[PDB]
Amino acid sequence: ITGTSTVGVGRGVLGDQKNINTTYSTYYYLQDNTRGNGIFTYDAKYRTTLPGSLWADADNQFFASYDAPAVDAHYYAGVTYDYYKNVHNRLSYDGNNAAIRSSVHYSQGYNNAFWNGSQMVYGDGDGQTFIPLSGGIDVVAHELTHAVTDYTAGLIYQNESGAINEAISDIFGTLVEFYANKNPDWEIGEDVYTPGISGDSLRSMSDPAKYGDPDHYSKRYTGTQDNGGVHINSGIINKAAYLISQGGTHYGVSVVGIGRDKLGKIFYRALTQYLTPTSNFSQLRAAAVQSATDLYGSTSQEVASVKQAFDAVGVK
Ligand SMILES: CC(C)C[C@H](NP(=O)(O)CNC(=O)OCc1ccccc1)C(=O)N[C@@H](CC1CCCCC1)C(=O)O
Ligand SMILES: [Ca+2]
Ligand SMILES: [Ca+2]
Ligand SMILES: [Ca+2]
Ligand SMILES: [Ca+2]
Ligand SMILES: [Zn+2]
């Protein structure tokens, strides 16, 4: 909408106060004009018609319980935009400052979030498996990264290419979480998953097997559930990424860690310059090796560590 840029204040899902960029025109709308061609957050009002209505608020104060998922979807989309712009010189998900749209309060008791091809969508959770999912910065960044993937490598959402797609979203979700630097970890969704259980998460990149996901290619899922295991076999790539960044010895293979920033550079380059819609894990290894070679040189530690990490997870 046309209006003037304003700054509201509110509380997120976890009860933390934050400022949000809004737009004033009669109402204060969750429309952040400070980033690209805008970040827009919508109320799906417990229904499934999308996007719903651009979030309107009378007073620019967003402290109601109903407001909290919108506050966080809006704010964390901003953080994610900043990560891609500041760290990777990428302007929004399409590289041309496409408007970023999110809807919250999607459906009833909805234990998921997704990119629907055009926008991000967040359930509120059922209060048992999840609280409103936009409360997780890694979740928000995971979802926006799906849009980045779809505009770049285009990894088909099934089997190995789909597991790479998932891992890319977990990797950049985690790197955005570290970028914001509030309780960062290599776990996925811990801030919104299972409010009645402390210390768990939906997935772990550092130890995927803690939640039943494979951490070695020899343990990959080959069945048909979950689009051929896209959220399962992502553990193999997540583990490789964790090892590249943090190092470790895994199934006897030692990996010299090179840190998060270089992980992000290598995988961003792989995603945007080498991966294709049909890339498999072996092709991801090759893309990551080539990306590290481009960035750091063929004889570099970074290239050696990429190879070690993929070796450690059984991907040649
Ligand atoms: C970071 C997470 C908090 C959210 C993440 N969402 P996503 O990958 O974007 C969902 N991807 C999806 O919807 O692709 C389908 C599609 C394709 C095309 C258009 C529209 C949609 C995820 O990991 N979801 C898990 C959550 C499980 C939770 C336990 C119960 C089981 C589910 C899953 O879906 O398996
Ligand atoms: Ca208000
Ligand atoms: Ca965390
Ligand atoms: Ca996390
Ligand atoms: Ca929990
Ligand atoms: Zn995903």
Side-chain angles (χ1 to χ4, degrees), residues 2-181 183-209 211-224 226-316:
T2 298
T4 192
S5 298
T6 47
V7 176
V9 60
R11 279 193 296 264
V13 173
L14 282 50
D16 54 322
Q17 185 173 302
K18 58 202 75 181
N19 294 338
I20 48 265
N21 293 293
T22 57
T23 298
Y24 177 74
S25 181
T26 304
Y27 284 96
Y28 297 89
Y29 290 91
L30 294 181
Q31 171 180 323
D32 172 4
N33 307 305
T34 74
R35 292 172 171 108
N37 291 301
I39 298 177
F40 299 78
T41 301
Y42 295 79
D43 189 3
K45 315 175 177 178
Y46 305 137
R47 297 188 64 99
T48 57
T49 51
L50 290 173
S53 58
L54 185 64
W55 193 286
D57 183 90
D59 65 2
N60 217 16
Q61 310 298 296
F62 298 82
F63 295 95
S65 306
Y66 192 81
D67 301 338
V71 169
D72 278 345
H74 197 64
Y75 182 92
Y76 293 143
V79 177
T80 304
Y81 177 98
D82 289 353
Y83 170 83
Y84 276 106
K85 176 166 181 294
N86 293 337
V87 178
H88 300 296
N89 195 37
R90 187 184 189 80
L91 300 177
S92 195
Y93 52 89
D94 69 339
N96 194 35
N97 271 153
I100 295 169
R101 302 188 197 274
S102 305
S103 300
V104 300
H105 296 303
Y106 177 81
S107 195
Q108 295 190 26
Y110 192 80
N111 287 320
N112 219 334
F114 57 103
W115 171 261
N116 80 338
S118 307
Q119 63 161 106
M120 292 175 281
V121 183
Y122 300 91
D124 289 330
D126 61 10
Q128 296 300 311
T129 295
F130 284 106
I131 64 179
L133 282 82
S134 59
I137 189 176
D138 53 2
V139 175
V140 172
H142 177 111
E143 304 313 331
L144 190 49
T145 297
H146 279 307
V148 174
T149 294
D150 290 353
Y151 272 87
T152 60
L155 293 156
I156 294 153
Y157 203 63
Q158 63 171 2
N159 302 326
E160 286 188 20
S161 62
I164 298 167
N165 181 317
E166 269 303 308
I168 288 289
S169 277
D170 285 346
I171 290 161
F172 290 106
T174 289
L175 295 176
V176 172
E177 182 173 309
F178 273 96
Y179 179 74
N181 198 30
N183 300 316
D185 51 55
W186 294 86
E187 303 294 290
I188 304 299
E190 68 285 344
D191 288 336
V192 293
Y193 188 64
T194 57
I197 302 168
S198 67
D200 68 342
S201 61
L202 177 62
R203 289 179 289 277
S204 173
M205 303 182 68
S206 58
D207 181 15
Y211 301 117
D213 295 324
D215 60 359
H216 193 277
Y217 194 65
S218 70
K219 299 191 185 195
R220 68 192 180 280
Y221 175 75
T222 57
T224 62
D226 182 36
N227 292 118
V230 301
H231 298 91
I232 297 172
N233 292 331
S234 56
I236 293 155
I237 304 312
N238 283 346
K239 181 76 197 190
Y242 172 82
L243 288 168
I244 290 166
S245 181
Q246 303 304 111
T249 303
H250 182 59
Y251 293 103
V253 178
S254 292
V255 183
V256 173
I258 64 178
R260 291 179 306 267
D261 296 349
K262 293 176 178 177
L263 172 69
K265 294 296 288 192
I266 289 162
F267 273 68
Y268 182 81
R269 183 166 188 85
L271 182 67
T272 58
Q273 299 292 332
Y274 292 112
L275 293 177
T276 74
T278 59
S279 295
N280 64 28
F281 284 9
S282 180
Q283 291 170 314
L284 169 64
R285 176 187 172 125
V289 168
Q290 184 62 59
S291 293
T293 297
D294 295 345
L295 290 163
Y296 307 111
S298 60
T299 67
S300 65
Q301 180 63 63
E302 292 88 348
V303 167
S305 291
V306 168
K307 296 173 176 174
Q308 293 158 357
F310 282 93
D311 281 352
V313 303
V315 172
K316 290 296 198 175

